[PDB]
């Protein structure tokens, strides 16, 4: 399975990539919202892990745009942890929303759960 990891912070992207590589997934990365949409179109990932505070296009906009044409599972991963943040992310099309800092093991389990019901 292929996972697109969207995060502008390289250290965070690297940690998620390492953990997804350990699960046997193929990993593709994007460091801003524009790169996220370009990688989504070129790579057709099975699941997207999506940061929200991104340069060029924010994660909420990326999710809304992707949802116009695809039902690909989206797991938002952000430091934005308010009730409004989680509700808006889910209402715009996210299948899950995990807050930073996060557990690598829980992330793996949620990606598995999402792939299970998608
Ligand atoms: F910058 Be991500 F929204 F944590
Ligand atoms: Mn960010």
From Swiss-Prot:
What are the record keywords, sorted?
Cytoplasm, DNA-binding, Phosphoprotein, Transcription, Transcription regulation, Two-component regulatory system
Location comes to: Cytoplasm
Q: Which cysteines are joined by disulfide bonds?
A: none
Point out residues bearing the modification 4-aspartylphosphate: 51
Q: Which residues form the Response regulatory domain?
A: 2-115
Membrane-crossing residues?
none
Q: What does this protein do?
A: Member of the two-component regulatory system WalK/WalR that regulates genes involved in cell wall metabolism. Binds to the promoter region of the transcription factor fabT gene in the fabTH-acp operon in vitro. Inhibits transcription of fabT, probably acting in an unphosphorylated form, thereby playing a role in the regulation of fatty acid biosynthesis. Essential for normal growth in vitro. Required for maintaining normal cellular morphology, acting, at least in part, by regulating peptidoglycan hydrolase pcsB.
Protein name per Swiss-Prot or TrEMBL:
Transcriptional regulatory protein WalR
| Species name | Streptococcus pneumoniae serotype 4 (strain ATCC BAA-334 / TIGR4)
Which residues of the whole protein are included? Answer: 2 to 119 of 234
């Amino acid at each position: 399975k292929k996972i697109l990891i969207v995060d502008d912070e390289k250290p965070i992207s690297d940690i998620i990539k390492f953990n997804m590589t350990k699960e046997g997934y193929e990993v593709v990365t994007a460091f801003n919202g524009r790169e996220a949409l370009e990688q989504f179109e070129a790579e057709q990932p099975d699941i997207i892990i999506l940061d929200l505070m991104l340069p060029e296009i924010d994660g909420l906009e990326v999710a809304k745009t992707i949802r116009k044409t695809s039902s690909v599972p989206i797991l938002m991963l952000s430091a934005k942890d308010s009730e409004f943040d989680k509700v808006i992310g889910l209402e715009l099309g996210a299948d899950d929303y995990v807050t930073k800092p996060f557990s690598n093991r829980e992330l793996q389990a949620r990606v598995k759960a999402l792939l299970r019901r998608s």
